[PDB]
Structure formats: C-alpha cells, structure tokens
Amino acid sequence: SEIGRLNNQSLLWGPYRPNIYFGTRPRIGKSLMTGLMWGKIESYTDFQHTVRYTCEQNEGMKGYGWDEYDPRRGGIQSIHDIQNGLDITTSFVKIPGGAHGGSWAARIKGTLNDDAPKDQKTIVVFYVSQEGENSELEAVPSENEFGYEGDVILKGRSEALGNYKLVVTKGKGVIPQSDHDLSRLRGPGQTVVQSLTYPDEVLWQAKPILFQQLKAGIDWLVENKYDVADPPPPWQVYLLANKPGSGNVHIVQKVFEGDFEFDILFSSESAGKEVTSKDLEREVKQATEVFGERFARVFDLKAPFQGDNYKKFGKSMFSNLIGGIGYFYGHSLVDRSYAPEYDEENEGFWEDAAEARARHQEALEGPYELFTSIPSRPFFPRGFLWDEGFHLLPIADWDIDLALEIIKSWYNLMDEDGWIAREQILGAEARSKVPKEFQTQYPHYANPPTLFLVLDNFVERLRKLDETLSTASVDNPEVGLEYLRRLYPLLRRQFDWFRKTQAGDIKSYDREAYSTKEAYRWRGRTVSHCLTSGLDDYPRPQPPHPGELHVDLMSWVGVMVKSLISIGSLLGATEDVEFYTKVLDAIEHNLDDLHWSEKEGCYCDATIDEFEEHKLVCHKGYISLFPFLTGLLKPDSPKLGKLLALIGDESELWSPYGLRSLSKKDEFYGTAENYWRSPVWININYLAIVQLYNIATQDGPYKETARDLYTRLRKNIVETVYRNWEETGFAWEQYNPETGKGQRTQHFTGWTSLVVKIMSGHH
Numbered sequence: 001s002e003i004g005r006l007n008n009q010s011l012l013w014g015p016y017r018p019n020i021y022f023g024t025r026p027r028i029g030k031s032l033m034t035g036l037m038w039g040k041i042e043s044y045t046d047f048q049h050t051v052r053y054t055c056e057q058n059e060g061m062k063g064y065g066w067d068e069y070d071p072r073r074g075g076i077q078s079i080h081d082i083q084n085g086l087d088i089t090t091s092f093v094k095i096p097g098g099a100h101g102g103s104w105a106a107r108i109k110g111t112l113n114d115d116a117p118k119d120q121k122t123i124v125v126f127y128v129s130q131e132g133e134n135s136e137l138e139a140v141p142s143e144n145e146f147g148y149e150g151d152v153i154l155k156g157r158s159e160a161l162g163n164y165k166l167v168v169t170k171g172k173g174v175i176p177q178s179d180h181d182l183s184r185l186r187g188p189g190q191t192v193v194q195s196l197t198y199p200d201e202v203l204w205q206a207k208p209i210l211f212q213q214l215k216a217g218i219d220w221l222v223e224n225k226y227d228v229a230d231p232p233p234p235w236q237v238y239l240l241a242n243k244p245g246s247g248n249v250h251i252v253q254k255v256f257e258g259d260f261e262f263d264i265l266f267s268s269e270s271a272g273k274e275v276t277s278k279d280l281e282r283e284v285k286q287a288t289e290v291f292g293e294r295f296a297r298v299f300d301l302k303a304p305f306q307g308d309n310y311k312k313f314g315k316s317m318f319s320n321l322i323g324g325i326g327y328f329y330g331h332s333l334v335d336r337s338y339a340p341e342y343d344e345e346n347e348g349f350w351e352d353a354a355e356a357r358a359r360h361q362e363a364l365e366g367p368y369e370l371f372t373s374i375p376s377r378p379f380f381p382r383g384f385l386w387d388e389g390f391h392l393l394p395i396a397d398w399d400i401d402l403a404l405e406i407i408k409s410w411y412n413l414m415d416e417d418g419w420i421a422r423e424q425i426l427g428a429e430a431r432s433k434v435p436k437e438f439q440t441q442y443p444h445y446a447n448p449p450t451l452f453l454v455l456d457n458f459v460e461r462l463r464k465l466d467e468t469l470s471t472a473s474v475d476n477p478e479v480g481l482e483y484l485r486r487l488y489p490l491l492r493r494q495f496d497w498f499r500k501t502q503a504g505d506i507k508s509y510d511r512e513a514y515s516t517k518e519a520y521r522w523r524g525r526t527v528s529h530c531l532t533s534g535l536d537d538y539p540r541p542q543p544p545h546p547g548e549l550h551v552d553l554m555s556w557v558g559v560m561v562k563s564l565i566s567i568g569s570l571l572g573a574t575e576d577v578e579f580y581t582k583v584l585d586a587i588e589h590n591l592d593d594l595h596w597s598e599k600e601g602c603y604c605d606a607t608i609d610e611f612e613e614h615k616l617v618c619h620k621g622y623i624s625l626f627p628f629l630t631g632l633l634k635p636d637s638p639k640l641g642k643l644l645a646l647i648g649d650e651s652e653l654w655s656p657y658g659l660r661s662l663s664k665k666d667e668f669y670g671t672a673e674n675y676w677r678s679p680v681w682i683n684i685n686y687l688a689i690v691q692l693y694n695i696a697t698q699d700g701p702y703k704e705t706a707r708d709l710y711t712r713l714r715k716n717i718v719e720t721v722y723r724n725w726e727e728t729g730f731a732w733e734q735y736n737p738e739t740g741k742g743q744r745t746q747h748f749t750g751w752t753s754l755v756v757k758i759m760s761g762h763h
C-alpha cells in the first residue's frame, strides 16, 4: 500500500492531454487543466485560420513530437509550424513535494524560422480551466490600468489539489505597441487576462470560448465607432480587453514581435517554497541527464544499430510512444440492449445485427477514467485495447511500475460480464474527434488480449526515488505478487468472457477433433471486414458464416491460458491451473485438427460449406502464421519449419522491407482498401522477430534457419522505419512492401515504436 501511494503521488501531474499540442491535467476527472494556443496574425481575418490548439497533420505542420520524455519527470517537445513560421519548444518538469502530487513548470519558447517575416506578430494564449463544485480560482489584478507589465498570478483552491498558485511569467520578447486611439481605452499593448465562468461541462471547448471573447471585443469596436476609415492594427483588434477576476476559466493572452519565451509555474502550496524560473531550468537540465543515463541502460542498441544516428532514432521513437500517455475522463457510448441479433447465430447475421444497431438503443454510461498511451496524437488520441498490448512492451522496459499502472487502469474498466470496450472514447472532448456513427461500443466485440504479453514479460522479470519507483514492483516480490493476486480474478474473468462470447460451433456440423470445446469465432464481422480481430480487411471465409472458425482468435486464447498457468502457479490456484492445463492441451490439438492445412502448409481459418461440411479457407499472410506468432508451437514442430519456409519465401510474404500482411500469391493481394492485404505492419513483424529469436537461441532443427531470418528481418524492419524517419520525420502506420515508403497515417506511435525494442534486443 506504501508503494501504491508513492506511484499515485508520482504520476499525478503530467502533460496528459496528448490530443492537443501542449497542455496539462492531473489524473483527476474534474480538476485543473491547462492548454496552449498560438497563431501568427497578418490580417483582420487570418488568426481564426492560423491559431493552433488540437493536434492535426497537414502541409502546414512539418512535424512535432517529444524529444525526451518520462511521465515521472517531464520532457521537451519540439513543434515545427510552417504555417506560422515558428519553431517552438515546450519543456515540462515536475517538482515532487507536498501532499498533492507535487508541482511542475513549463517553458514555451518560440523562434521564427528563416522564412517568417522578422517582424511577425504572434498571438499566444494560455488557457486555464477548473471543474468542481467547491473549487475556486482567482486572477490577482495588476497595478497598471489595462493589463500586466509583469507576471500573471492565479490563486486557486480545491479538495483534490489543496491550495496552489499558477504563474504565467512576463516573458522575454518584443511586445508590439499601438499608437492608435484605442490605446487610450485598451492600452498600447500588454499581457491581458479574462476571467470567465461557464457550466463545467463546456470548459474543454477552449477554441469556441476564446473566439466568443474575441468576437465580443470586435463587436465592441464596431459599437464604438472604430471602422475602416482608420482601423487599429489586427493584433490590437484581437487583443482582449483586460478583465481579471474569479471564474472557472482564465484566458491569459500575450502578443509578441519576433522570437519569444515565457514560463508557467505551478506551485503546490502544500509543498515547500514556491517554484521559480531558475528552478525550472535546473530541473529541465537534470531530467535530461537522467533520461540520457536510463536510455543507454534500458535501450542499449545492439549491432548494427550502435551508432548515434540510430540512438537519436530510438530516442525519438521512444519519447513519442511514451509521450502519448494521456488521462481521459467521462461517459462512453455503449449499446446495452444485448439484442439477440448480436448472437450472430444465423446465415446472413450481418443484416440482423445491422437491424439491431438501427434500433439505436445505445446511451452514455460511466463516468469512466483511463490512463493510457495512444496510437495517434493527430487522428485517434485514445486508448485501443490490443494496441496498448504493444505500446507497453517498450514502456515496461523503461518503467514496469508505470506499465502496471496502465494495465490496472485498463482492467478497472472491465464490466461484470468480463468485457472491456476495445476503443475508449471518454467524455465530450474525446467524442469531438469522432463521428457519432462510430462512437458506440458493443459488449460482444473482443480485441486481441495483447495486454497479457506485457504480464508475461513482468512474470519472467519477477522470477529472475524516481529510480526506486520505476522498478519497485519487481524489486519487492511481495508487492509484485500482491498486484497479480488482485489482477488475477479479472484476467480469469476476461478469459471466461472470451469462451462465453467468442465461441465457435464444433458440435453442430460434421466436425471431428480432439476437443469438443475449443473453437472460436470473432463476433462483429461484416461482408468485407472483421474489425475486432485487429486486422480490418484481411480476407476471411466468404460469405461470413456462424460456422466460421478463426485461427488467430484460438491462438489468442492460447496466449491467455499460458499466462493464467504462469500467474495461477505463482498464486497457487491449483484447482485453476489444472483446468488451464487441459485447455492448453486441447487448443494445441485443436489448432492442428481444425486449422492445419497439409495441402497449403499453414494454418487457415475455416467455415462450413454449401453441403454443410467444414472447409479450410487459406489466405497466406499474417493470419496463417498465428500459432507461431503467439509462441504456441514446439521448437521442433514439423509445422513450425513449414511456416519458416513461408515466412522466408520472397514470392509470398518476405519483402526487402518486412513481412507482407498478405501473400503476393493470394488473390486478395493489394485489393480494395488494401489495409491488411499487402502492407508491412510493425506490430505483427515484432511478434515474428521475437518468435524467430526464441527458436534461434535454442537447441533444435531450425536454430540456424531461425537465426538467419531473425538477423535479416530485424535488419529490414529497423532500416525501413529508420529511413522513413530520416526522410520524413515520422513514424508511419504501415510500410509499403514494394517501395518501402511509409503510408497511411503519420505520427503512429503507436506500435511502430516497437522498433526501439527490436534494435536493443537481448529478448
């Protein structure tokens, strides 16, 4: 309980709003949040198009991301904005102390790029909001008439945070001055604050709230005879009238000519002395040193990636992955009808289930909270179930206590039946990034249980103060077991939930096999898709059919039983461990009996035919290697070796750039949206690389073959991601097997980042 409270205290504050360029919030649903906004202003209508706040990716932004980050300490973020001619640094640092989760500081630095006019006007805004019934926040008024010559001090109080002061410093930088008649009523130009109150649930809507104030300002100009005959400068037209006070929103605005910097100092009163700029500098410096030392220890790049170029690459892939960590809070949209159509028991079941959806029974439920890393800051800044399985493997290396926090956070969402929604859209803010048609979660929709992989890694570590806290759950085996003891019931619940809801039909067709129980079929499939599997458009038996069996799903169950055995063993759940052992046995046999093709030489999904007999439907690709990817095969398996032939074969899956999702020989190669139908995906490649390495480092028939493919596949995967990073600055969602080019979505960190773990090795 001691270590648990120390983690709470340590992880409370962070820049946990990955959906915006820069902002802070604690791991409290209703509390204090900050956000940064900037935009050049050249005209009377331009700011609304230039201003930046939520993350996007267009021709306007060269790139951005974290150059170093640890959620316990802070980090530095770099933003390269073409539209606004600015290179921005956002440095954030945490100062432990008091009872309330410590303090923190940020420095915003903006440098004009060579293209920007030397005399650019740039509007910067710091937006602060506080939710809660019994909380207060006040801007201390200034001496001077029209705004601030110096720092803005906000004093606030809340049950969650105690007393605090949030200071936005005067800054370095030329501040432009107006000789217009308006300066008599608005001042010649200075820092300003507007204190406002709105009903709590709209506070997150910083852009509209801001724009509403600017609009009222411009309206006031027009009411008071300032016109096109003789107008003030644009930048003065968009400077807000100063009106500090109290409210649950505080708009702090500055305008700069040329380069600029300013600081935010959040001072927890319950702590010792208040935070200073000089403080922020020291801690920024200190954090970097610590980051540096830990990176070289945890991510020791092995040949041929020992070079500094690869080190910068790793540091970028790592910092963006871990930097995506967010805290989200609010209601989810869930259909709790449990319509019978979602049982998908009929032929044509996809029209049945569409009819139930068209009943629109869903409603908001919760609130819920989640602490999680995300795949994509610009496009999907939210938790995806099987994604997090992958995100946490490098994170777990860095800070196992951290990863366990995230696992806990995920498992806390599980409902009474055993279900966790595979996509976590929590609260109005999260919903703003998502069409309503795609918000609704479905209690019958699974997602690969990849979080079990991280537990598997923790379990091997457990067998064999920011320093202490990162590893406290492995260094103190009592602590480690107590975690598993508490988690175990939930793991088991989820296992049962898969077998209850994702069951395949053996007994009701002409199907002979060693076990009558073991067969699985992903609920949720449409004619062309099966989103729940993770592999959107990978070809599946056509037409979809309740007699389908999916070899990937079965292998995922295998992944879970094996973990339940390890974790059960460790807690001594003897009754349980024996159930597992009979299940793992049956899956082993059943994988072969239901999914093995001796003709094709790989594992296939199955359906039942027109004549009601079990057919194999083989599509040589990731799906076909699943038992191997998930480590279910014995190292001397004849089948394994046949699969090694497939993996290595250039005319099938082996591209210079990684394993192709689908074989070049399959009819569905590069068809339709071509999502999982040729491209190279780093997450599944990572599984292939890990499993090759296992075979390569053991006595057995395939040792040297596995070793060769490990060597080359590692090389191809790392190089492809790195060349693309070098050329484009980005991690990509997937990679083109013909050109090697990164495609689909940028800023995918995201499981692409597994590249730092591939390079560093000693699995």
Ligand SMILES: OC[C@@H]1[C@@H](O)[C@H](O)[C@@H](O)CN1CCCCCCCCc1ccco1
Pocket: 375, 379, 380, 384, 386, 387, 534, 535, 536, 745
């Ligand atoms: O990383 C999560 C998820 C993985 O779990 C799956 O394995 C993967 O197959 C698909 N990805 C991405 C899902 C994208 C969410 C849909 C809203 C995005 C809107 C858009 C579409 C184009 C650009 O923006």
